[model samples]
Target: KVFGRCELAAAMKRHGLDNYRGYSLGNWVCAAKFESNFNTQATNRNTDGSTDYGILQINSRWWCNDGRTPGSRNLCNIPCSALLSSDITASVNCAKKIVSDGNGMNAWVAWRNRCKGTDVQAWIRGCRL
Candidate 1:
């Protein structure tokens, strides 16, 4: 697991996400903060009978497979468990695909509700890089 916020930011930077697709680093940091508190293994149940998985908390309905059993569109071609790994590669790639689909970061409800139109700079505060 990531040691803290800056480590996650560094990972994002390494992935060329500091200002990816017109979204700022602050925007991503804010969304990840609320979505999973920077924990890769985070997961949550949804009222719609789907699950949110990983640091970005992607939904099982469309993005990743909830289990080997089936029920998800699994559009990212990776297991939902991949999102839960500390590596962050699969999660970031799937998130990029989501953004590329024109939904932007708005595909994440956490981004819309918690990060949108907010003073998101604090998300990257004190993280020099």
Candidate 2:
């Protein structure tokens, strides 16, 4: 069967993070719990009055506002509801990009080498998800 929340848990494991690391997938879930409550389609208005969309709670007009040709957009053109499509890679990638700056987790090249060791948990102590 396709994985559900476990997809993120597995992804974190592959990335050398323990289940409880502040920056692990579990941490992201904690954020989602309050931000959108795991509702992939959850959204809210920003303080400046822009509509934020998606599970990552991406801003509709902020990150996803490429007009027509998606190439103009630096980030991938994922429909706000793509989160509901059960695409964990896509969903997490979006959030990762936002976190790591227009680049996904891969953007943190500095952290890759450090994450390779089995004791990745020790490296990410007191971190944020």
Candidate 3:
């Protein structure tokens, strides 16, 4: 596992981030890279048009309204306290799942759109890996 590289190659290869066993670590890195620069504990105003925040750029006002848990509805409404405790595997998996689900190139577009299928090159873009 490479530090400061947000790209989950090892994890994606093992868990298959997309296409029912296909690893999409590139997308994961793209999202994390563009969102937080691979900084797991990163944060941004996200006041622009997106409500992004945190390492995975998990919007605090979209998923957790009660300020606890990840699956909670409207969770994004929550603050940034738990942003530091976000699970690495879960973050990578969830981002992959988002891309796998075909919910539009979210934080995981590096695979569906950019990387195509080559997991290696995608990591090289702008030194994301």
Q: Which candidate is the best by TM-score?
A: 1
- For model 3, residues 5-118, the per-residue Cα lDDT tens digits are 533444444555533345345555555555566565665543333344455666544442334334445523344444444446545444444444556554343334544454
lDDT of 3 at 25: 52
lDDT, candidate 2, 83-120, per-residue tens: 55544456666655566564433332223333333343
Ranking by TM-score: 1, 3, 2
Q: lDDT per prediction?
A: 0.84, 0.48, 0.47
Prediction RMSDs, each to the true structure: 1.7, 9.0, 6.1
Evaluate model 1: give its TM-score: 0.91
TM-scores, all candidates, are: 0.91, 0.50, 0.52
Name the weakest run of 10 consecutive residues (lDDT summed) in model 3.
63-72
TM-score for candidate 3, residues paired by index = 0.52
Point out the higher-scoring one by TM-score: 1 or 2. Answer: 1
Task: Give the best candidate by lDDT.
Answer: 1
